[PDB]
Amino acid sequence: TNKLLIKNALIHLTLAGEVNKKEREDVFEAMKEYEDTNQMIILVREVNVPAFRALYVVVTILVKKIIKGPKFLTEDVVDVFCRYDSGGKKLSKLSSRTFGVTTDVVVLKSAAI
Amino acid sequence: MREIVHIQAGQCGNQIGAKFWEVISDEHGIDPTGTYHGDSDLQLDRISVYYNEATGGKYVPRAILVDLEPGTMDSVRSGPFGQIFRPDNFVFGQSGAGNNWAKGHYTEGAELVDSVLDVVRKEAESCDCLQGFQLTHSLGGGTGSGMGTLLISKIREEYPDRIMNTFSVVPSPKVSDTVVEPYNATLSVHQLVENTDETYCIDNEALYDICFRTLKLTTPTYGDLNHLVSATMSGVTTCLRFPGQLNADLRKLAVNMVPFPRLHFFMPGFAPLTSRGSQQYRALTVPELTQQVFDAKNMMAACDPRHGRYLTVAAVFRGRMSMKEVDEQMLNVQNKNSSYFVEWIPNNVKTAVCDIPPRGLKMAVTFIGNSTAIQELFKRISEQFTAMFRRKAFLHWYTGEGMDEMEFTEAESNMNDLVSEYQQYQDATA
Amino acid sequence: MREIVHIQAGQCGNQIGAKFWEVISDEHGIDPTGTYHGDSDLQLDRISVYYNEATGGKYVPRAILVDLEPGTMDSVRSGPFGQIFRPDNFVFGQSGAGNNWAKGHYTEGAELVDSVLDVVRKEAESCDCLQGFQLTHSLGGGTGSGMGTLLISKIREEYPDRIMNTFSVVPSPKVSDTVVEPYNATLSVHQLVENTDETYCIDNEALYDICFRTLKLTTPTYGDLNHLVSATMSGVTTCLRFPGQLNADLRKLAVNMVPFPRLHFFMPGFAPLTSRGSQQYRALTVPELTQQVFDAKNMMAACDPRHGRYLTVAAVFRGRMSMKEVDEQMLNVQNKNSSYFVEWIPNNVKTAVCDIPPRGLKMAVTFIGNSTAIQELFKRISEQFTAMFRRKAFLHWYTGEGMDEMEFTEAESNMNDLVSEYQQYQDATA
Amino acid sequence: MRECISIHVGQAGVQIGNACWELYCLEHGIQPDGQMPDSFNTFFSETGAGKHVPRAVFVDLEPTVIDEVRTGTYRQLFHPEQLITGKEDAANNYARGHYTIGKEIIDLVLDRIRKLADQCTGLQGFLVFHSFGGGTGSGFTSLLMERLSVDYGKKSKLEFSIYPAPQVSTAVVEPYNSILTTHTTLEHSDCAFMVDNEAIYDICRRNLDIERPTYTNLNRLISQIVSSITASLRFDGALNVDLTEFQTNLVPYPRIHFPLATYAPVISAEKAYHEQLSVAEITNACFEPANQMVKCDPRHGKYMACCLLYRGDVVPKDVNAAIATIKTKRSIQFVDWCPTGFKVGINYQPPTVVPGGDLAKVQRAVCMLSNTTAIAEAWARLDHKFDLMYAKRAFVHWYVGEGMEEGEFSEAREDMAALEKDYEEVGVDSVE
Amino acid sequence: MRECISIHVGQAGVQIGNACWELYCLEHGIQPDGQMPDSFNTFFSETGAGKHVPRAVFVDLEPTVIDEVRTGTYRQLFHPEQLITGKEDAANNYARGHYTIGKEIIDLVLDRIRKLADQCTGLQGFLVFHSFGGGTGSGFTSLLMERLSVDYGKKSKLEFSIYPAPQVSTAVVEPYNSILTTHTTLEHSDCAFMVDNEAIYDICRRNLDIERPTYTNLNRLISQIVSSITASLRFDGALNVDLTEFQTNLVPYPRIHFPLATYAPVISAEKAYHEQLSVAEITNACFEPANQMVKCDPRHGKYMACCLLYRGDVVPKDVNAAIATIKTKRSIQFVDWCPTGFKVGINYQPPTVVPGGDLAKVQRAVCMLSNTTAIAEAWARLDHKFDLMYAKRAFVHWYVGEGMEEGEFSEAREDMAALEKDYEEVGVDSVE
Ligand SMILES: CC(=O)O[C@H]1C(=O)[C@@]2(C)[C@H]([C@H](OC(=O)c3ccccc3)[C@]3(O)C[C@H](OC(=O)[C@H](O)[C@@H](NC(=O)c4ccccc4)c4ccccc4)C(C)=C1C3(C)C)[C@]1(OC(C)=O)CO[C@@H]1C[C@@H]2O
Ligand SMILES: Nc1nc2c(ncn2[C@@H]2O[C@H](COP(=O)(O)OP(=O)(O)OP(=O)(O)O)[C@@H](O)[C@H]2O)c(=O)[nH]1
Ligand SMILES: Nc1nc2c(ncn2[C@@H]2O[C@H](COP(=O)(O)OP(=O)(O)OP(=O)(O)O)[C@@H](O)[C@H]2O)c(=O)[nH]1
Ligand SMILES: Nc1nc2c(ncn2[C@@H]2O[C@H](COP(=O)(O)OP(=O)(O)O)[C@@H](O)[C@H]2O)c(=O)[nH]1
Ligand SMILES: Nc1nc2c(ncn2[C@@H]2O[C@H](COP(=O)(O)OP(=O)(O)O)[C@@H](O)[C@H]2O)c(=O)[nH]1
Ligand SMILES: [Mg+2]
Ligand SMILES: [Mg+2]
């Protein structure tokens, strides 16, 4: 999997600090019964400010829903397809429009909302 | 134009203000006498924002000094930068407050208010265009919490459409250097939230760690704590009185910053803060000046910013730099702190740049926070007020000086409503 | 770009690194202050692989110095090349581990660990593009085996897609300078085989013979054992920061080298090693530097290379030479050692050439071995572990510091599985 | 002959004007003192004595940047009755620049324009320089378009509006000053230009290798674009364009009049070599997302109409060669109902370099002006800020107690609600 | 005219090109600063000002060797947008040059090529220089033949692959980076040249009496061979050959397109005397095992289609006399089905000596590009190295954890399983 890439990104870019300690501790154990799933991706509202809205899984081609947000993902509704950089805790924008083994950070579209 | 009258108060602010005019006279090259020795002619282009000019090229600080004992006023008049003031402006009584909000507002405050407001009226006529009044006091004592909040309940009566920034040195959480500071604060916040547009709430305990951890000192005297506070006091209004690439004043730092008519409690911050020998190990760059600011250990208010969320953030810079570096770094620290910023205010980073650094540095940031991180500061005061009211200790010094017991229940339900607005109208994210 | 953060820990790793930064300052022409005095501008091409560049042209090492008592920290700060570091980096405790793996990982290490990882986080953001982390410690002691392997159980939780080379000065076979070093090592190899990509294991006994036999010295001080170790630490990364013909880095010296995800325990080797007066008896040539390397009496790990077999071989050369002589001699030593290499890996010699020699010589070779000949190093420790656990000597210092007796059963079948994987997957020939 | 006056509202207008009126003095040999060592009689009504003075009004409410003009390099150039100061700024309060303070000095500005508007007879157009951010650049244009479209009405008016960026923000009520002015400036403007803050930094970093630019250097790249709209009023050309022509060629409806500028070539002095700069080369540089000056993907929407204001030694056949390449391409897709929406103007003067400036000395240039569909996303942005900063009624009491009814805010979104549907209306194709 | 661009993937592609682009500047009088004190319009899209800049794309993932080009002798020559750097190399990992890092800047290369293919209309071919060793070399190339054979498709494409040497080796996964790229580069290349590292040391030691060569002096011999293929484009000859003519005569089947160079005279300066250099002398020098730049015995297998590219002072009668000797000789045995598989190109210009170089100034040269059968043993070699490094699953976890299925490794040998049989399928003689 890429389990250390998402779990590091949960408490350093998306849900970080004393404010949302109710929030992220609720969603560690929600994906504890999961994460044997070979890939999980997160959702981000804007590339301007990376904030958490949805944690998703990819079960082997269909994106299931887990804990707010839509249920299935297509190539059309998602604007960018990014990669979590570990060195500077920012978002590496991948050039691949489709899915991949590596990508985790996605941003939806206001036309899909 | 756009003059500022600098009303002082209390034992605290008169020793802050004794250091603040030491800061301002050096930026404009002013001696202890009152003449001019500055290098840049850009100094005297806006010397009339603080300094009325008199005969012989002398300048006087537009400053009104208020006390109830002749104690600190005798110290400042004999101290350095003491002869520069006007001997008419020194207003003082003889009874002395002596740590009593009941005395500083009714017993002695409400008898020597007209020896002050006439001198205010003299200086409002000295103004070409009245901009706003700044007051320097403390919620802890008796004079600065009693006489100041009487004058704010008189100035907005008389000058209702001018901005009123107050400095109130908030009592620290751990040590209590006043036994009735839960009674000199709660009876002042009631008077400040209805008649002040902005209040630069500054703690003490957080200001010692900056002297300990960051400056790396051993013996922090008050001459090196107010020295750091007056660095921030001039950092607000320096964008007014100097040419900048992106200009700002007291009003632009009021309109962009106050969303609701009650939530106007600011927690400042300053950078760079070097050491004496460790000054030559860090790079003096805009990505380095900003990352110093947005931590917790360089907030002058002793409350955790990671508890509670920011609403509006001002970053008044100084010095000459590159605007892309600023616009990049106001994003880069907004990317990683995006969990801390609030949802329903997008692009909540106000920016302003000057073109003159402080005298000796190369570049400097002055930070003006506004968070829900100060909800536990008032939760602390409203809980110390709760225990001392149930035993009703220390009550006979107030009731005997003309004050009712329901007024202590008025302010406690007042502040516990205001703590809820940092919780009701914080997490409303539609 | 491609920055390297140099964490130091323990008493040993700090004294190694205090000689290693003496090396790097001299290749790049850095004074004791931190300014520049080098001759060739090729030093400053990749000067940002180890150095945050501060103001005034000064450079500071990207170095984080960790200890649990200020004994060695007071030595290095008052020693030579001591002022070059950052006084923010010197994070240290007060209690001291004192030869106790259970103290430096649970008791004292697991309380002041977040005072280190903030400065680690601060320097990863100082990077332009993070390449990897090099830790310098020793398995024998308490701090370098307890505090260090705690940090690898934190950094891989934080920086999982980077490379983590460690130097761990292994206890020598014959003499033991620590009573419970069979307990400081077996509880550390468990914390290195799952979390480090490569590990340059160094024995002590082999490093005394080279000072005795080949260098021909009488009194080998630690200032001349680490001096021979620091010649190798800057023998690996010198292809990453200098323009060579066939370039290699910290990653190409990991992908070509580590066939299975567990067998990453290396044994270095340096040449030429002259004497003080016997240098004028040998021709300084490429067929002469190679034949010095592949013997037994110039391996820094005290294990007989003829016992067991190599899997892979890396021979990082330095200095300017001819690429046929390299291609010939790497063939030639595989002719005569054709029974000492392994069958099922053909062309098992990785080679790279730099174009700048060490300052003063003409050419130098940094050999990076990899063999099954380190199976008896672990057969030695896990047999010393076996008797001292049967009588369960020295057990109450660990049980009383937060540890169960099952952990000595976990780590014992751990290493006895590792020795079998140098025997199960050694003689598999097809 | 034909004369046009310039108005500089707010700080962003004045500091741009400090860069414009440096450039026009250099393009004609005009000294900073108004001296010079006949086509330039459009911007400079001269004295009978030997001195040219500009046709400029620098209105401002705070006296900070005006005193930097009165003490700057161009002290002697201006007539000091033009430089109009004030007392206290509107200070990012929209009702403090349209109601409270700007009403006090509205007679001094209009009467000073009234003296300039009867200095000649070819009163051509209006150049207004302002932003949308602050309280003057959008709070005093909307009053000054209210007056000058009642005094004159039948003229042509140009607004060079600095656009509020999607990423970079130096204000907090930055959407509480654009929706308020678009209630007013929509139905009385002619052609409002959009220039973005963010998209110039991508052009200053990548295409110039300047990593640390300044607002000195951003304002040069807007002064060059302004000096190519009015290039034909100052120089003889093959195919001249007029300010009375841009209202006709580029405004297909009484609502949609929002073009986004585009300039080429933007390359440094060291990269002024190494390429050949044909007009087949410099035209394809304009039609890429690498050279946009609004942060929008142009390959999302469709170009309705375009324009190409070439200048320098340009061969008019190769223009016709370079255009015919474009319309037969895959990515560039116009709207179906427009036959072909180009409009080409060749002028005979190369752009002049500024000393100590960024740009190299090139021979040919282009100021593409494009009224495209894809700015609708940039208008969908500043409704979403109004969607969230108004359900909680943030920052409203600074507006209500300054001569402004807060029932107007539910009305001004319906202005923008219709305008977002109009780009969706025109962008689809009328079948049958 | 007829223009051909050159892509230099990997370090070995760059360092060969560092020796190539020294030679084209000398073979035309071009200074290193792009100056000169009409046939050279095939690699040098010149400026209108006097400067010639090469048609070359240098791509690399690690910034080391690019900074040696950006500080070398040819600093001023290149257009600096061509020099595409990266951040961190693929580092002998195939799935780090095709999935992880190569996908980052694949649009930075293709869009930069996109602004070169629209500089001339005679887009002739491609010259991808790359090795098989490194992670960039055969890992970023196989993505680029994927992309350019979908953009262009119908063009002609040429590789110059530094072959992994049979006995000497400087990597460990060097038999992994070739079997993985041959799954990808086979169905998109059209003539992939094998040049061996080991066989050049046999020529530099023996035929030159230079005992200590360098990669400076092994690249000179590959720079002379590339300047013997494109010599007919750059000069006038009696019997010219073109880069569409190589792909027809040399590819007898859509799989087998693996030729190997050969070059005579490789002799020193002291032995430039003592013989006579007739074209019947040096022709037999090409057909010796002592002048084979792949370490294989040519007298084991057969030649399917040789090709001789003479140049300099060459008389075409003696060529026909030299060929008439060869087909009657005993050891050289062609294949039965081919009638006669020669293809001769006589050119006029001699090879020019490089100053400080190895070779003498000779009058004539030959680049025998033989497509032989005997390279099948060299493909039988890298199936033996694959299998003993796959039954133990050596080095697999550095591939699986970088975006690569480990079921694919049982398939790329099945690619080579058919291709090993095809040489044995064609090399036999069809009876009846
Ligand atoms: C006049 C002259 O040329 O003197 C030489 C010298 O004579 C010899 C004998 C040196 C010398 O080495 C020793 O005496 C020695 C003593 C104890 C342990 C190791 C070495 C030399 O000290 C060492 C020194 O090496 C360096 O300067 C390298 O840069 C080296 N630097 C250090 O080790 C170093 C020493 C002190 C302080 C800081 C650094 C190095 C090697 C590898 C990687 C990085 C740096 C050299 C060439 C010289 C002297 C001075 C005598 C030799 O060693 C090295 C490492 O170069 C020993 O055999 C070589 C051959 C050298 O010719
Ligand atoms: N292009 C450009 N924009 C600028 C420059 N300086 C400031 N701006 C923009 O100006 C906008 C702010 O508008 P202002 O006119 O200054 O505000 P105002 O309140 O109306 O006027 P003042 O308060 O009197 O300065 C911001 O969006 C800035 O990006 C500059 O040099 N160039
Ligand atoms: N003929 C020749 N071969 C070279 C030269 N430089 C390197 N090589 C060969 O290149 C092979 C190594 O693979 P490379 O592709 O060059 O490595 P790289 O291009 O740096 O790729 P990465 O480092 O993995 O990104 C070895 O066989 C070297 O002998 C050179 O100048 N000439
Ligand atoms: N920062 C700062 N705080 C001060 C100083 N002097 C007093 N204080 C604080 O002021 C509070 C006491 O109030 P004080 O002003 O002296 O009493 P008052 O004269 O009745 O207003 C305590 O919290 C003190 O720590 C000073 O010079 N600097
Ligand atoms: N090579 C080398 N080994 C050292 C040095 N100092 C200590 N050691 C070795 O380190 C081991 C003791 O560990 P130590 O690091 O001092 O204890 P710790 O501080 O608890 O990690 C012994 O095997 C020593 O021989 C030194 O300077 N050089
Ligand atoms: Mg302004
Ligand atoms: Mg490489």
Automatic annotation (TrEMBL), chain A:
<protein>
    <submittedName>
        <fullName>Predicted protein</fullName>
    </submittedName>
</protein>
<feature type="domain" description="CKK">
    <location>
        <begin position="1"/>
        <end position="113"/>
    </location>
</feature>
